[model samples]
Target: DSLFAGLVGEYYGTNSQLNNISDFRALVDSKEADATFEAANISYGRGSSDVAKGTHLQEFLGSDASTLSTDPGDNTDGGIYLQGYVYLEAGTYNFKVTADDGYEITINGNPVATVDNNQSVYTVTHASFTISESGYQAIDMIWWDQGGDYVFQPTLSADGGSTYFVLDSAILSSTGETPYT
Candidate 1:
């Protein structure tokens, strides 16, 4: 009984939504649904020298403007590019970034060291994060590409960050699952 104590909680359960398919083959032939996650994973160039780093909220790619967007065929390379501030308690975190062609990610506006730059399918990339004890900190991400197809998505739900529009994994783990769940 003690072992199951942690699982007890007030919640809602629903079983109204259900759909069945006649045949797997038939389902495969017909197009069904298109759901998209609100995230994009870009690529970073190879060779440490190719990277262009900057402070948080500043330009990591393209011009120093607040926002930037690339055409379908603008640069030969592609990578992750982001600039945002995250305030959280100090802790270790594992960030998984997915990309095509090639990719890389930065935190607090510093280039992510120790990981190769390239992108792939649902291929979850790895990066260790250690937030400082300071009150509020800045976190930035940048990605680029090198002449190839493009694929990138960034879904950061930490395993210690503030829980707001984006899900923080710390709260998720403590409660047993993602808040979105």
Candidate 2:
């Protein structure tokens, strides 16, 4: 009943992980220096950056990696991208990702799941899709932590396999109309 029920988060920052996703969409479509924000909860990890500099919204309980961030300054090696929109009520859903050093997930833009291997702990990747039309759907997430002991966890479930959580903040929001700082 809650798959981040109404999600909207857009955050981008980089220093690495720029090897895929078409060079991370050409470094967030050029003008590169990396660091952008918009929040509704995309949960960060390892040290700080609980996302707040303008129109605020920060909440995290699940979706592991300890939800840490504090403006791209020592969050280990760097890389974060999160886009959102969700309103699923169709069917089969199971998308989980636990990370230590790489990640990728896309829902409406295709490419359902990925985890690139660089473990020391935190490892689990998944994919299972079937949402034949319900409502708002579009979510994209990319992450990286090229140092050590940093992680990001993403989860979702629709009873297809029973229980999977994390990803709240009433589903999230932030595509346009104030929320990019």
Tell me the tens digit of each residue's lDDT in model 2 across 112-170: 77765455436464768888987657777776544445546677888865788766455
- How does each model score on lDDT? 0.32, 0.53
My TM-score estimates for the predictions, one after another, are 0.39, 0.29
lDDT of 1 at 169: 25
Question: Model 2's lDDT to the true fold?
Answer: 0.53
RMSD of each: 19.4, 14.5
Model 1 / residue 160 / CA error / Å: 9.3
**For this target, which candidate reaches the highest TM-score against the unseen true structure?**
1
